[PDB]
Amino acid sequence: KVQTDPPSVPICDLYPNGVFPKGQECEYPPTQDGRTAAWRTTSEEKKALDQASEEIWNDFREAAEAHRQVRKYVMSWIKPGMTMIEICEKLEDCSRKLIKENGLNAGLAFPTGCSLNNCAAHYTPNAGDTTVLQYDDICKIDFGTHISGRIIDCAFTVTFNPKYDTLLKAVKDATNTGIKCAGIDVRLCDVGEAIQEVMESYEVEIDGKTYQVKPIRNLNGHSIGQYRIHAGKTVPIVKGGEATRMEEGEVYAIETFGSTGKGVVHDDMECSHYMKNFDVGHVPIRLPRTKHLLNVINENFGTLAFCRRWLDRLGESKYLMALKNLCDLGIVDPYPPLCDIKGSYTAQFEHTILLRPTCKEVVSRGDDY
Numbered sequence: 001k002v003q004t005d006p007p008s009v010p011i012c013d014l015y016p017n018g019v020f021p022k023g024q025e026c027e028y029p030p031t032q033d034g035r036t037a038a039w040r041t042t043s044e045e046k047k048a049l050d051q052a053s054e055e056i057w058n059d060f061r062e063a064a065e066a067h068r069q070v071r072k073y074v075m076s077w078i079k080p081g082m083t084m085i086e087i088c089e090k091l092e093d094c095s096r097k098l099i100k101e102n103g104l105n106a107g108l109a110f111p112t113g114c115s116l117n118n119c120a121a122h123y124t125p126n127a128g129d130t131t132v133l134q135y136d137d138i139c140k141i142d143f144g145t146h147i148s149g150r151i152i153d154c155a156f157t158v159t160f161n162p163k164y165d166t167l168l169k170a171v172k173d174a175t176n177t178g179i180k181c182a183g184i185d186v187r188l189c190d191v192g193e194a195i196q197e198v199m200e201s202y203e204v205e206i207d208g209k210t211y212q213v214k215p216i217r218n219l220n221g222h223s224i225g226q227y228r229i230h231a232g233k234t235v236p237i238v239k240g241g242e243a244t245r246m247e248e249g250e251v252y253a254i255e256t257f258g259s260t261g262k263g264v265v266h267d268d269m270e271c272s273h274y275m276k277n278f279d280v281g282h283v284p285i286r287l288p289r290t291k292h293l294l295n296v297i298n299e300n301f302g303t304l305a306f307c308r309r310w311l312d313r314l315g316e317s318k319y320l321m322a323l324k325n326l327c328d329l330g331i332v333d334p335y336p337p338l339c340d341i342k343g344s345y346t347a348q349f350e351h352t353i354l355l356r357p358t359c360k361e362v363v364s365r366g367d368d369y
Ligand SMILES: *C[C@@]1(O)CC[C@@H](OC(=O)NC(C)C)c2nnn(Cc3ccc(OC)cc3)c21
Pocket: 110, 111, 113, 121, 122, 142, 153, 218, 219, 220, 221, 222, 229, 230, 234, 253, 273, 274, 275, 305, 306, 335
């Protein structure tokens, strides 16, 4: 009936009637000629539509409340000296409990990113990884929760040295300015341009060197679909892209990455993250270890992302060759860590937003960010 400390009560038990709290609700921006969009908020036609999707928005809100409680707990104990494995296991244990993990009905949407320094995304440790979080590290915590395949993608940056404080502010401001710009009929490239303009208004000094903060050109916000983290609409963080448009009822991950490096990421380091190709259909496999592994993936993850550690915990071993086989057949795709140049520093902030008929909801907003 109230949440414990450390948190252990499922979000579903704290809201016994099943109605989960709304995120930050916002009027859409005015149209570019100048007209207002407040009418959506009082329209019967829009209120009807919105109600027809209530159970959906409610599933996102449950997932979002789990994400707020997990991240508040992580900020309380994450410290240099902890191993990356210990941080991810402690976060994931809490997430499993709060989301009340139940197969594909509720669970973890994707592995815990905890990318360091010049690495921006897609690092989680594999077994045996001895990496320890240090005092000068800049660490992107990116973790996802879901209810019925309704995904919260939300991310923040942890530091301990105040030298990064201005970089964190830039990226936060840039992300908030993306969120503000977003709305129905807005051009995706318009959201990108707003993000860029803000991001580059920021100069930062880090150990006696000055930089203008750059958005990472090839990391992008994106639409979200059911059991589909990246559903094909992509949002730049630089100027230049398609001028296509956000539509009513869609869900977006609005993320920005800021960098003191080239502002471009390349694959580097060993792969931890994998995910079935959403568009591959059924493929009969006779090779027995490869068949078994695909069954394990279909059972436990479907089209959601997973990592090596999550196979290990299911009791699978000596599966690397079978995993490679699935990648080589195109059934599974690998997602290796994405890093800017050696020596650079990268930061991230991200929320999930719902483009409801009646209002824009930053479903994952907290008091924290
Ligand atoms: C994978 C990542 O965290 C970072 C990449 C990003 O995709 C893009 O920016 N794509 C461009 C069009 C090149 C992205 N979108 N969602 N996430 C969350 C996530 C997805 C998959 C996964 O494991 C496979 C983990 C996290 C990201």
